[PDB]
Symmetry: D2
Subunit: 330 residues, 4 copies
Amino acid sequence: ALKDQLIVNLLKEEQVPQNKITVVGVGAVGMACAISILMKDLADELALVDVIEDKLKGEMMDLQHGSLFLKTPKIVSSKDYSVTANSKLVIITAGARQQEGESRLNLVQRNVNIFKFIIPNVVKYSPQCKLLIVSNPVDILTYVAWKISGFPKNRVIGSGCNLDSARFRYLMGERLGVHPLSCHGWVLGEHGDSSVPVWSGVNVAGVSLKSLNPQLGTDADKEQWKDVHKQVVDSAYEVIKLKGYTSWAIGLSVADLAESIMKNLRRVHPISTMIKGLYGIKEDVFLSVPCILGQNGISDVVKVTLTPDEEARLKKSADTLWGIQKELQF
Amino acid sequence: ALKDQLIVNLLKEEQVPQNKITVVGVGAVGMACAISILMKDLADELALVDVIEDKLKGEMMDLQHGSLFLKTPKIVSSKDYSVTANSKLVIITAGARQQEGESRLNLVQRNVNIFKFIIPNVVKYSPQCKLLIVSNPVDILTYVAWKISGFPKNRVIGSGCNLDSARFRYLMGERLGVHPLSCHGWVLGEHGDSSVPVWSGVNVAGVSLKSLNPQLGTDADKEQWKDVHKQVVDSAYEVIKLKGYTSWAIGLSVADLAESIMKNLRRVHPISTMIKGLYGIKEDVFLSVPCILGQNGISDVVKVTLTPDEEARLKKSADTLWGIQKELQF
Amino acid sequence: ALKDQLIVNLLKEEQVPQNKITVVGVGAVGMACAISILMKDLADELALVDVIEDKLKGEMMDLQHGSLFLKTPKIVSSKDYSVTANSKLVIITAGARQQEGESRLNLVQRNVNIFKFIIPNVVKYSPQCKLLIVSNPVDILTYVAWKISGFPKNRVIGSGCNLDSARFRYLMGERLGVHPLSCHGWVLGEHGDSSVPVWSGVNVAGVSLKSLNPQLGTDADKEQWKDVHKQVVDSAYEVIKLKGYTSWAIGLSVADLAESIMKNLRRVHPISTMIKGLYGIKEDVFLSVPCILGQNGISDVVKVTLTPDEEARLKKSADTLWGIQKELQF
Amino acid sequence: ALKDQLIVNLLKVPQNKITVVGVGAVGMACAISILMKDLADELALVDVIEDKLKGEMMDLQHGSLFLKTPKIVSSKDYSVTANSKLVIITAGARQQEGESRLNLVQRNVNIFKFIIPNVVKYSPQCKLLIVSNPVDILTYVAWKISGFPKNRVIGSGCNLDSARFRYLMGERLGVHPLSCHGWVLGEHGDSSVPVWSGVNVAGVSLKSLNPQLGTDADKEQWKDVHKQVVDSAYEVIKLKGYTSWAIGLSVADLAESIMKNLRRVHPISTMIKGLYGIKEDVFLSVPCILGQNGISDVVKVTLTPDEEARLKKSADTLWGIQKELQF
Ligand SMILES: COc1ccc(CC(C(=O)O)C(=O)O)cc1OC
Ligand SMILES: COc1ccc(CC(C(=O)O)C(=O)O)cc1OC
Ligand SMILES: COc1ccc(CC(C(=O)O)C(=O)O)cc1OC
Ligand SMILES: COc1ccc(CC(C(=O)O)C(=O)O)cc1OC
């Protein structure tokens, strides 16, 4: 054959990938995650898994055709979870998503039932992986994925409020004329309607905005910074109303988390984890607090010092999640 | 105001961006171009333009929400082309897109009409820009943009066979077990069924595949390497059939061209340009040849030495194209 | 000619660089700046200037030889400043450096003499440039560069405490087991012995470490965090003692600042600027405060809220610097 | 403790670790290039001068905010190199002004007798990337001392020579080196072989446009481009005392292919017995497919009778030198 005329093989090709990533779900979110991960050079192998055969193969092919411009030498796909074997990171984006006017919390029954199939198949073929849950409601589904998988909780991470916080920082930067990277602010709790803007931590260069404007974030605020958090709460719905779904921002947020995990960076992100034992929470609620994220997932949790109102709001968010979570069967 | 309590302003700045890129059309291809350009840090401003107000705004907001994870500090959009002012590079992806089974040539009058609106407005707000045409049929539409714009030919560029050649190199790499970066081969002429694979230039490490197999690419070829070119030609149709459109590979391909232009790299790409004076072409025909691409667009063309067959294909591939443009309604 | 047989020139047009950076001085610091800038793809042209012709040509050549692995297509050098023409950023690293036991402030009369030649020659050819001063004492020398050039203050920047704060954050990171990216804290004032750690701003995820231990940074601190600031102050001298000079950290710090400028990011950095008007400083003192940095240099200054002790230490640094400024002879 | 007031700990070993042996200019250029390409989750430095080594490590560590490599470590003790995927050897005598690289061989063989077993002890499954000169001989020596299979012992070889050739070609043609193709093979030194037959832009053979290409009869004396390739290190040594930046970038390129399993083709030094007519345990540069298991495959270039004689000449030296070494 021409190959053997051109190339003498010197080594029997027993290839196993060292930095493999799998994306489960090839909808808009799953593919935004995939392109973002490919463009950040995080993986030596990318696997895609979903249940619509043609769509799956099409997306795989489309990515493959860009290989010249990438540094991820193997892209593969299958309905069959065997294709995901040996992953270091598996990103779960499959399941129903909310219609306009529908809460993420309304997806729980559908997505728990889908997780009962997906999670055991993932763990079967990728015993060393971290699980990164993106599907909604992400906080509850991280709990569900954790219980189903048999993984210790450090290895099951919800994309959580990493996106809400990035949205908050974008909006804040726009108001201040400063890059989001230098505008610090944390949105914690549910990735959803009950998220908590932590005004007391909002700062540029370590200067607290609340110390300059004590009314910051209340209705008494002349500049109505509370509308920043409302915009954050509403952003999924506003973008769904305009383009039908959201994809790019969540894709970049997931890639950001994947980078911290794959590169063992130990950066702090607001992501879904067990918060039992903090702020008086007694049940296995998962929600976003600032977490140290590295090669073994979430190794540490930062204990944010919240105002009485912030803490009340965070407890109220835990309560809302528990209200849905305690009724689940799986 | 809180901003003024926090920040003392030194000057009212000259706000003209220095590395602005505009993407016209926020369909799947336009957005894939957008996200790829964002992830390659090519621009200090990205502007989006299209005619569907909500979709446009939705896409802009979604990109904006990822700003924390990017290094492109201003992302803007409008149906009004004034938002595109001072672009170094304007990428046109707007217009009708190819349905399943539909040929690119079938898009030609619809898109020539769309270009009568688009191109003058682009030229109005960025008279010094380079135009990068992606919409199909890309060869004919690059000609149309050139005639309408009044720009010198160096600044009107078609994405042409850049992706086709990328696909060839991927498929070649899959056959040889080599990364496509190290697999070389050129697909030239019309971006479509009449493209030409230049068998003589197909090589790895300067070793010509044709010298190892003199029947390479011909019907007597035992490994039927011509099927690699058939796959190249059929790729977009196969992918459209599977997922409804193509996006990722063309997006990456365009970002690669954007990179050469914006960073003045003077890499050689097979892209659509005015080849009158070459291969016995005496009309104002645009098609892909290897072009040196930098900050003034296409400054130079590589003269590929074609076999008599390869060159006959090209002068035909030409007339296939020039038949149509001779009689265009604009 | 072979070039003419292979390539048809289609365009005579004068290449004028769009993103040029000049590095003045090709000692260890200058070359660390150059390689870092090259590896961050910040420039379409790099110019080097120094006074020793062989060393200059050798360094230029060595960088040139790595061009295949870079995306900066023109690397040039000369002892003549005409080579620097049309730079957007000019980085000044030439001058004497301190010995062990010697203060950076002892370099002032030598480096003012050098600056009286270098500065007028730099500004002559680059009307759009920002001047980024790295040579020591950097704060004083930014004042000198500003006086000699007659540039407005936004355009004359000293690398200042960008490195000192990077070191602070590294050492804080080490203590806390968190990446320095997530460890926030500001060292302001002189890049030297009189620098000021802003304990009140030191935080992770918005949580003030001083709020948790109000003794943080004082002599009553059980954990002696003041030693972290002492390590920052002593870092150049410790490294000089071990390897003879410092290069890598300052090179990365300068490239960080070049990135904000070249990409108009508007990130906040602790860099040397004119602080007359702030903290009741009444003289044209330059020193590090958090500055918003972009394509027009420093457009805005963050007014950090300092404790009375922190403010007194910053005024003390300002006094020290003013005292040396009063020794300057133009 | 402040840390505990701030952080609740829940969990109490690197996956992509690279070691650079030698913190001379070459080693540190490799180190900075590897750091700026985000190739490693841990970088270890090893050398014999303890102060210089600590100073370099610290200087790198202070830039950590600006990097994505979260652990940088150093020691004279090779235990610091444990769990390396890739170990890059840059230590030894360096080429001196006006002297062949072959003048370093005995001294660097001696150094390798100490270095290589220590590397092998702590990372028995690493890929070894030899950079020290003369790189072809020392890659052979590393292979013999380590006992590794030949795929995992790689010499930087002519990777930079070919990068220089493409730079020079590019300057002549007004084209980026990424688009100018051409291979320098054989010994990394004065007897390297420019393969004129493969020199091309966009698949267009330069020889086809100028049949005399690379010969004495060449009107444009393209052989001078190879002469400049051969002379490059000597000229830069003359001017600045050593070379560092281009080699660091070349090494980081090879590290990239290995660490990311790219299977790109590089002209690097490999055990070429059986291939290209050679019968002894000799290493020299040919185009190799490079990935996570080192060199898995070699491209067979159709060489002219000359290119083949030279490569047998360029070759024959090395075995004569290697037969006389003992370890
Ligand atoms: C699995 O589907 C999704 C998961 C998360 C998002 C992100 C989205 C959300 O959480 O609804 C957002 O906040 O933009 C979008 C999805 O589908 C479009
Ligand atoms: C704007 O529409 C398109 C332009 C180019 C491509 C790329 C396509 C082609 O050029 O036919 C391909 O090769 O995938 C696809 C488009 O719509 C999906
Ligand atoms: C131009 O000389 C220098 C400027 C700054 C530094 C940085 C250095 C210092 O300020 O002494 C440091 O803090 O590491 C080092 C230089 O020469 C080695
Ligand atoms: C460790 O010694 C070296 C190894 C390679 C180079 C690179 C050099 C060469 O290979 O001769 C070159 O080509 O620049 C330089 C060295 O010392 C400075």
